[PDB]
Write an enzyme that holds these catalytic residues in place. Structure first.
Site, short mmCIF file in Angstrom:
data_model
loop_
_atom_site.label_atom_id
_atom_site.label_comp_id
_atom_site.label_asym_id
_atom_site.label_seq_id
_atom_site.Cartn_x
_atom_site.Cartn_y
_atom_site.Cartn_z
N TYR A 1 -10.61 27.74 47.93
CA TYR A 1 -9.99 26.61 48.66
C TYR A 1 -10.75 26.38 49.96
CZ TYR A 1 -7.31 30.26 51.16
OH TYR A 1 -6.93 31.41 51.80
N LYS A 2 -10.55 25.21 50.55
CA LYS A 2 -11.07 24.86 51.90
C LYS A 2 -9.87 24.80 52.84
CE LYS A 2 -14.98 21.73 50.88
NZ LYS A 2 -15.25 22.17 49.51
N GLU A 3 -10.08 25.21 54.06
CA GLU A 3 -9.06 25.31 55.13
C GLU A 3 -9.69 24.57 56.32
OE1 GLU A 3 -6.54 29.41 55.48
OE2 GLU A 3 -8.57 29.33 56.31
N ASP B 1 -0.56 26.68 57.91
CA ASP B 1 -0.33 27.98 58.56
C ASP B 1 -0.29 27.75 60.07
OD1 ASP B 1 -0.35 29.34 56.11
OD2 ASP B 1 -2.40 30.16 56.46
N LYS C 1 -1.84 28.25 67.18
CA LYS C 1 -2.95 27.69 66.36
C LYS C 1 -2.44 27.26 64.99
CE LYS C 1 -7.27 29.21 64.13
NZ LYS C 1 -8.65 29.52 64.56
C1 LIG Z 1 -8.66 32.76 55.31
C2 LIG Z 1 -7.63 33.80 55.75
C3 LIG Z 1 -6.37 33.13 56.29
N1 LIG Z 1 -6.76 31.91 57.00
C4 LIG Z 1 -7.52 32.17 58.23
C5 LIG Z 1 -7.79 30.90 59.02
C6 LIG Z 1 -8.37 31.23 60.37
C7 LIG Z 1 -9.73 31.12 60.62
C8 LIG Z 1 -10.27 31.44 61.86
C9 LIG Z 1 -9.44 31.89 62.86
O1 LIG Z 1 -9.94 32.19 64.10
C10 LIG Z 1 -8.07 32.01 62.63
O2 LIG Z 1 -7.25 32.43 63.63
C11 LIG Z 1 -7.55 31.69 61.39
C12 LIG Z 1 -7.30 34.76 54.62
C13 LIG Z 1 -6.93 36.07 54.90
C14 LIG Z 1 -6.62 36.94 53.86
C15 LIG Z 1 -6.69 36.52 52.56
C16 LIG Z 1 -7.06 35.23 52.27
C17 LIG Z 1 -7.37 34.34 53.29
#
Ligand SMILES: C[C@@H](CNCCc1ccc(O)c(O)c1)c1ccccc1
Length: 160
Positions: free
Chosen positions: A72-74, A105, A86
């Protein structure tokens, strides 16, 4: 008409023996994105960062086999220093392919004393009603807890 979409919220907290400011500083650090696989041992088959790490940055993530979702993209959509808040949105793939229309989130780092805080993590999603029972068990606090666990450890060690 249409049947209403359903809204679900899940919530996770971690108490941390460090200042809200020290923890907020890592969560909001534009350098964190690149370091994510340093903070999560594996999990990532692939991580592409589009943007400078700051607000507006898109992360495109592929997960090792088995792990649902796989891809996925976030997008980092808000940083609020005054509230230490945040927001990160899932923008393509992942649960959006299983009837979820919105997935957000929120991390809120809340002081519990001069030198203590609590990381309040939440996920809010909107889902088509016929997909509620399908996605309900897939969407957990696992990823938020893993993020708070890694950042907590990093900060307590940077200052022990
Ligand atoms: C990708 C992360 C959760 N999302 C993270 C987004 C994010 C990026 C950069 C940031 O500085 C921050 O505070 C949040 C994840 C974890 C475990 C399992 C699956 C995904």
């Amino acid at each position: 008409n249409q049947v209403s979409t359903v809204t679900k919220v899940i919530h996770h907290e971690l108490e941390v023996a460090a200042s809200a400011d020290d923890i907020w500083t890592v969560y909001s650090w534009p350098g964190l994105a690149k370091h994510l696989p340093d903070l999560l041992p594996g999990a990532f088959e692939k991580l592409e960062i589009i943007g400078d790490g700051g607000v507006g940055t898109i992360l495109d993530m592929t997960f090792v086999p088995g792990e649902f979702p796989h891809e996925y993209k976030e997008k980092f959509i808000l940083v609020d220093n005054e509230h230490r808040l945040k927001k990160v949105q899932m923008i393509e793939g992942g649960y959006l392919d299983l009837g979820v229309t919105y997935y957000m989130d929120t991390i809120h780092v809340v002081p519990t004393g001069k030198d203590s805080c609590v990381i309040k993590s939440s996920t809010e999603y909107h889902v088509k009603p016929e997909f509620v029972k399908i996605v309900e068990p897939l969407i957990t606090t696992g990823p938020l807890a893993a993020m708070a666990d890694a950042i907590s450890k990093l900060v307590l060690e940077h200052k022990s």
